Amino acid sequence: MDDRTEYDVYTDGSYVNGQYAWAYAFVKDGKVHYEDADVGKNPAAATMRNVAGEIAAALYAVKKASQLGVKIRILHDYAGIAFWATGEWKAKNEFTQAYAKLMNQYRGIYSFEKVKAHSGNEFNDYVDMKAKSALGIRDLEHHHHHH
């Protein structure tokens, strides 16, 4: 039906030994509805340094997002994806380009900035701490930064 989240989704940044996997957090009615990841095997996706898997999540995340009639972080989400989205390398570089294409494919529930291609960093791992806020963790502090 709907949701009430306000934190980045658990996507981008995951692998076992040397493979690539994509995961995400689902919530319905403002509560945990689903919970499960998925691994690949294909070479085209297992040859991009397991990068295709990190972004992969954001892909399937939107596709299903339309099924649950819900939406993901869009309000200045940024996330790790917005890291390379600034334009670090030509769009041709790597198959990451497909990402920008898959956007319009299911664009209407989520939002994001311009993502050319190429990548390589821990910008995705950031979702680890962010997602923690959505999952359900306690704390007590008041601080932040800007970039």
Binding site for Mg ion (CB under 5 A): 79
Q: How far is the CB of 108 from Mg ion (least distance, A)?
A: 16
Q: Which residues pair with 39 in a beta bridge?
A: 21
> What φ, ψ does residue 68 adopt, rounded to 5°?
-80, 0
Residue type, 138: R
Nearest residue (CB) to Mg ion, 47 versus 66: 66
Nearest residue (CB) to Mg ion, 38 versus 92: 38
Nearest residue (CB) to Mg ion, 5 versus 97: 5
From residue 104, alpha-carbon distances to 32, 44, 114, 115, 146 in Å are 28, 22, 12, 12, 29
Coil, strand, or helix at residue 31?
strand
Nearest residue (CB) to Mg ion, 47 versus 133: 133
Q: How far is the CB of 103 from Mg ion (least distance, A)?
A: 12
Q: How far is the CB of 124 from Mg ion (least distance, A)?
A: 8
Rounded Cα distance, 112 and 72, in Å: 10
Q: How far is the CB of 57 from Mg ion (least distance, A)?
A: 8
